[PDB]
C-alpha cells in the first residue's frame, strides 16, 4: 500500500470520483468523514461507523491535546489503537477549535503553546494519517485587510508545517500533509493563497474559512472561483461542510472530501435526515408513526425501529435514542456519498443533483 | 412451544438449574434479567442485550403506563415490536414504582387508578410474557402490625390479579402469572403469605419486600426460611436483587430468577464488575491502564478496549462510555449466571460459591 495515492476514475463537469490509497486503507471520493471529537464518534462504536460505509474519520489536535493528552495517547499506542478504529484518521490542526472552548495570538502560534511545530508534533503523537497544516481561520465577515493578514500568516505557517512534517522521517514516510487555503470571500486572496500552497506543495488542499456564517449562496460563489485555483490532481477538502445540499453543490464545484458535526450533533437533538428533507423526530406527529425514519434508507435503524419508538426515546432522554438517530444520520450521509460517486461514474451526476434537490426541498 | 413449562434439570442443596419454556423462548435458570425501564435497556440495542446471553428482560407497568402509554403501545403492536426484543419480557405490576417518581392508597388500588385489574390489563396491553400480580411492597423497617396489614392486602390483591388474568382468554393462554410473597422479615407472615399464594396458585412465586434497606445478612436470614415455603416445582424470583454476591447466596437459598438496575445504572456511573470485585473506572489509576475491564471476561468490550480508553470516555461524559460499561456489566452478570448454572449441573456449586467469594472479596 502506498503512503498516499489519489486517483481520479471518472469526471463530470467539475465533479470527480476516485480513491485515496493510504497505508491504513482506501478512501472512496467524494468522501464524508464522521467527526470524532474526543476520540469517539459520539454514540457509535467504531464498527458501527464502519458499517455505515465510512472509510475515514476526523479527529482534532485541540480536544485531544487537552483530554486525554497527546503524549498520553502516544504512550498508549496511538489514537487508532486507543479508540479502536484501524482505518485512516484525518486530524485537524487545532487552530480552529482554540479560537472553541483568554487567547493570545502571535506569529509563533496561540497560547491558551500551539505553534505550527507543536501542532504537527501532536498529530504525529496521535498517529494521524492525514495531517492538517496549522492555520488561522479568519472570522466572517472579514475586512480585506484582516483577511489578507490572516491569509499571509497562514501561508507562513503552511511552510512551517511542511518543514516540521518533512523533518520527522516516520511521519513523512507514513502520513500525508494537507494545506489550507484561506482568503475569506475574496478572489484575489484565494488566488494568492492557492499559489503559495502549490509552491510549497501538499498531498491535498483544503478550502478553509467557509461555513463560518456566510450562507450557501456565498459559499458556492466563493467555491466557484476558489476550487479551480487548487492543483487538479490532488484532493480538495471543504472543511466543516455540511448539510446534504451543501455537499451536493460542493461536489458540483470540485470538492472531494467533507466533514461536519451536523449528522451526529443534530441527530442527538432529534433531527433525522431523509430524502424528503430533515424531520425533527421530537414532533408529536411522530408519536404513533410506525414508518422508519426514511422510507428508502438501508441502515440497520430503518430496518428495525419505527419513528414512534425513536420519538419516545428522544423525548425520554434515552441514550439509545441518540445511538439510533446518530447511526441513521451517518448512514444517510454515506448513502448520499455513494449515490454521488455512482452517479459521477455513470455520467449522470448533474441529473442526480437536480433530482436530489427537487425532492429534498 | 408451551405457554409455560418450568423444568429442573439438576440440583445441589437448595440450588436448582433448569429451564422455563415459553412461547417466545426458553429461559435458562438461574436467570438474570436486565431491566428495561422506559422500553429500553439503557444504552444497549436489544441485539446487544441478547449477545451478552440474556434470555429475558424486565419492564415495568409504571414508567410505560406514563410514557409512552399502555394503550399507545398496544396500538403500535405491543412492547416486543415497539422496542425490538422478541424474547420473553417480565413486567412488574407497578405498585413498587408508584410509591418511584401525592399517593392515595386504598383497598381498590393507588391513585397518582392503578388497581389489580388495571395493572393486569396494562401488562396485557404491553404483551407481557410473565405478568406480576399487583401488590403493596411494605417499607423496611416495618412493624409487625403494618407488615401484616400490607401482606394481607397484597394477598387479597393476588386473588384479584389471578381472576383478572384468567378472565382474559388471550392473556391466560399465552402469558404466565407470578404471585408475590410479602411479610417483611417476619417468618409467620411469610408463611401465611406463601400459603395464601399457593392456595390461589401461580406459575411462579416472587419473594417481594427485600432489598429495601435491610442488608445482606438479614436478607439471607429471611430467604433461609422464606424460599422453602414456596412450591418447590415453580420458579422462585427474588425481585430487585442484586449485587453478584447477593445473587450467589440467593441461588444457594433456592432462587431461580433475578433483576436489578445495578449493572446498568452503576455502569453508567463508572462502576465495572470484575471477578476481583468492582472497580470505579473513573479512578485516576486507570488513566494509562491498557488492560481490559476484567482479565477473563469474554465480552466484546474486553476484547477490544482498554480501561484507559473507557476511563477517558466516562470522565469526558461520552455516550460510548455508558454503552461500553453497560455491555460489559451485563455480560459479566450473564457469565456469572452461566458459571452458576454449569456448577450446579456438575454438582460443584458450593465450591464455586466459595471460590467466587474468596476472590471477589
Ligand atoms: N469551517 C472550517 C472547519 C474547520 C477548519 N479548520 C481549520 N484548521 N481551518 C479552517 O479554516 C476551518 C474551517
Ligand atoms: N425489591 C423489590 C423490587 C421490585 C418489587 N416489585 C414488586 N411489585 N413488589 C416488591 O416487593 C418488589 C421489591
Ligand atoms: Zn436509516
Ligand atoms: Zn467485559
Curated annotation (Swiss-Prot), chains A, B:
One of its GO terms (cellular component) is cytosol. Pathway: tRNA modification; tRNA-queuosine biosynthesis. GO terms for biological process: queuosine biosynthetic process; tRNA wobble guanine modification; tRNA-guanine transglycosylation. It holds the Pfam family TGT. GO terms for molecular function: metal ion binding; tRNA-guanosine(34) queuine transglycosylase activity. The keyword Metal-binding applies. Residues 240-246, 264-268 are annotated as: RNA binding. Its EC number is 2.4.2.29. Changing residue 135 to A: Abolishes catalytic activity. The active site is at residues 92, 259. Changing residue 259 to N: Abolishes catalytic activity. Gene3D superfamilies: Queuine tRNA-ribosyltransferase-like. Binds 1 zinc ion per subunit. It is an enzyme of class 2 (transferase). Zn(2+) binds at residues 297, 299, 302, 328. InterPro entries: ArchSynthase1/Queuine_TRR (IPR050076), TGT (IPR004803), TGT-like_sf (IPR036511), tRNA_ribo_trans-like (IPR002616). Belongs to the queuine tRNA-ribosyltransferase family. Homodimer. Within each dimer, one monomer is responsible for RNA recognition and catalysis, while the other monomer binds to the replacement base PreQ1. This is Queuine tRNA-ribosyltransferase. It comes from Zymomonas mobilis subsp. mobilis (strain ATCC 31821 / ZM4 / CP4). The lineage of its organism: Bacteria, Pseudomonadati, Pseudomonadota, Alphaproteobacteria, Sphingomonadales.
Amino acid at each position: 500500500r502506498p503512503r498516499f495515492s489519489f486517483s481520479i476514475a471518472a469526471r463530470e463537469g467539475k465533479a470527480r470520483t476516485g480513491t485515496i490509497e493510504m497505508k491504513r486503507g482506501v478512501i472512496r471520493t467524494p468522501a464524508f468523514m464522521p467527526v470524532g471529537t474526543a476520540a469517539t464518534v459520539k454514540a457509535l462504536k467504531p464498527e458501527t461507523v464502519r458499517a455505515t460505509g465510512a472509510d475515514i474519520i476526523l479527529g482534532n489536535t485541540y480536544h485531544l491535546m487537552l483530554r486525554p493528552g497527546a503524549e498520553r495517547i502516544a504512550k498508549l499506542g496511538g489514537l487508532h489503537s486507543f479508540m479502536g478504529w484501524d482505518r485512516p484518521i484525518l486530524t485537524d490542526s487545532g487552530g480552529y477549535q482554540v479560537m472553541l472552548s483568554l487567547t493570545k495570538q502571535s506569529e509563533e502560534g496561540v497560547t491558551f503553546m500551539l505553534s505550527p511545530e507543536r501542532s504537527i508534533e501532536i498529530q504525529h503523537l496521535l498517529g494521524s494519517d492525514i495531517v492538517m497544516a496549522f492555520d488561522e481561520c479568519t472570522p466572517y465577515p472579514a475586512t480585506p485587510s484582516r483577511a489578507a493578514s490572516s491569509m499571509e500568516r497562514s501561508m507562513r505557517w503552511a511552510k512551517r508545517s511542511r518543514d516540521a512534517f518533512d523533518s520527522r522521517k516516520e511521519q513523512a514516510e507514513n502520513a500525508a500533509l494537507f494545506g489550507i487555503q484561506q482568503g475569506s470571500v475574496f478572489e484575489n486572496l484565494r488566488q494568492q493563497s492557492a499559489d503559495a500552497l502549490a509552491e510549497i506543495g501538499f498531498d491535498g488542499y483544503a478550502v478553509g474559512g467557509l461555513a463560518v456564517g456566510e450562507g450557501q449562496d456565498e459559499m458556492f460563489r466563493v467555491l466557484d472561483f476558489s476550487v479551480p485555483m487548487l492543483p487538479d490532481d490532488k484532493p480538495h477538502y471543504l472543511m466543516g461542510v455540511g448539510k446534504p445540499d451543501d455537499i451536493v453543490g460542493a461536489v458540483e464545484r470540485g470538492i472531494d472530501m467533507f466533514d461536519c458535526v451536523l449528522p451526529t450533533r443534530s441527530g442527538r437533538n432529534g433531527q433525522a435526515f431523509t430524502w424528503d428533507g430533515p424531520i425533527n423526530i421530537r414532533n408529536a406527529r411522530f408519536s404513533e408513526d410506525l414508518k422508519p425514519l426514511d422510507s428508502e434508507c438501508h441502515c440497520a435503524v430503518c430496518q428495525k425501529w419505527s419513528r414512534a419508538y425513536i420519538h419516545h426515546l428522544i423525548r425520554a432522554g434515552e441514550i439509545l435514542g441518540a445511538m439510533l438517530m446518530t447511526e441513521h444520520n451517518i448512514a444517510f450521509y454515506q448513502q448520499l456519498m455513494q449515490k454521488i460517486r455512482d452517479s459521477i461514474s455513470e455520467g449522470r451526476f448533474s441529473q442526480f443533483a437536480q433530482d436530489f434537490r427537487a425532492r429534498y426541498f
